[PDB]
Design a protein around this ligand. Structure first.
Ligand SMILES: [Zn+2]
Length: 410
């Protein structure tokens, strides 16, 4: 299971490929399989559909549908009892190529950034990738703390889903009678329990957040009134977690559903936290550009530095949509051209000789560069286009850049 940013990029790419496909009728099959849905169960479901497909009126459709389902069965023989992490999505169907000819497409997308929730069987004129294109929305692990005077909830924001894990109660004497010329406050007793309260909440945050150590990207704290302020301002929460707190937010509901409200109210603070590694990468890149050394950009120059193993970090735009087309000249120079994915490979005149170059391969430009980076153990970061320098990586520098450790040549 590769990096999450890398998984997001792979999925968007394949999704675009799958949507380019179309059958002559209703014969493209899509199956979403949650990680807890057993394989023999879905294998059993397709057998049912394969048998039911005998009822299909037109022969051509019947043959195509049954071939697609048969191909699914065959593919699932290479999987164990359960689909991999986060589930699995299967696509299968006889697609329309040219001249009335068909081609069997069978593909499986394993382990989305966000786990598959529900099992779904779909048969259509197009592959069902829309529900998959929505679980590519968020990234990051964030701790959540909501507390009141009565209760407290601690949990996770894993991407876009909220997960309550720990909970607590007041531990102070109860509410009851107001006024009556009486005030049986337990002055010192209450403040001890309140200190003990907030300390156990820190404990909860310690039992939970220290596991995913640096893995968490921030912590949200919610609560109404000075209750949250009192909790945050007074050093109860332990400084080690006070560090990664993104901010305090006004949330007046403190049950398990308050965690979702916290995520809602802190949406702006979250989107900025998401950009932490990106903004630090690009700030470092621009300082090296202005510094005149240790920086590279553009597909050609980035590729060259990658080969030399001189690249500290490969920086590629996550919104990149280019293919690299690989060429061979009769005199043995491997040229390269980048174009948009949906564009036919361009005619290439080969500088160094002027002869017409011959296309011998084509692949995703990032996949191409990233394989080299992996050989040299170079970290590859996918830069969001949301912020200014991240957008400029794409629009000003072509979407390809690299921070060097040793600058040389050129
Ligand atoms: Zn040439």
């Amino acid at each position: 299971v590769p990096s999450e940013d890398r998984r997001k990029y792979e999925f968007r790419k394949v999704i675009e490929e799958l949507k380019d496909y179309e059958g002559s009728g209703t014969q493209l099959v899509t199956i979403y399989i949650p990680p807890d849905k057993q394989i023999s169960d879905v294998v059993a479901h397709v057998t049912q559909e394969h048998s039911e497909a005998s009822n299909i009126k037109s022969k051509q459709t019947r043959t195509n549908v049954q071939d697609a389902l048969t191909s699914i069965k065959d593919r699932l023989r290479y999987y164990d009892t359960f689909p991999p992490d986060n589930g699995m999505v299967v696509f299968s169907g006889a697609v329309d190529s040219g001249g009335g000819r068909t081609d069997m497409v069978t593909e499986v997308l394993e382990s989305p950034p966000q786990p598959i929730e529900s099992f779904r069987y779909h048969c259509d004129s197009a592959f069902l990738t829309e529900p998959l294109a929505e679980m590519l929305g968020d990234k990051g692990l964030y701790g959540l703390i909501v507390l009141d005077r009565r209760e407290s909830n601690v949990g996770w924001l894993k991407g876009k889903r909220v997960q309550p894990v720990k909970s607590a109660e007041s531990l102070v004497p109860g509410k009851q009678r107001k006024g009556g010329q009486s005030a049986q406050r337990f002055a010192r007793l209450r403040l001890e329990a309140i200190d003990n309260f907030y300390q156990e909440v820190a404990g909860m945050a310690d039992d939970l957040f220290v596991p995913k150590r640096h893995e968490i990207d921030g912590i949200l704290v919610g609560g109404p009134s000075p209750t949250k302020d009192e909790f945050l301002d007074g050093d109860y929460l332990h400084h080690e977690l006070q560090d990664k707190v993104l901010g305090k937010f006004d949330v007046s509901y403190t049950d398990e559903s308050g965690l979702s409200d916290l995520v809602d109210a802190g949406q702006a603070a979250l989107a900025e936290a998401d950009l932490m590694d990106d903004k630090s990468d690009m700030e470092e890149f621009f300082e090296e550009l202005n510094g005149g050394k240790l920086a590279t950009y553009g597909f050609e120059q980035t590729r060259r530095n990658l080969i030399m193993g001189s690249v500290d970090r490969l920086l590629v735009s996550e919104d990149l949509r280019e293919d690299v087309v690989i060429y061979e000249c009769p005199n043995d120079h491997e040229e390269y051209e980048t174009i948009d994915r949906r564009n036919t490979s361009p005619e290439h005149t080969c500088s160094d000789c002027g002869e017409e170059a011959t296309e011998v391969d084509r692949e995703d430009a990032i996949d191409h560069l990233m394989s080299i980076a992996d050989q040299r153990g170079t970290e590859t970061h996918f830069i969001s286009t949301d912020f200014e320098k991240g957008e400029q990586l794409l629009t000003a520098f072509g979407g390809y850049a690299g921070i060097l450790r040793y600058s040389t040549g050129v």
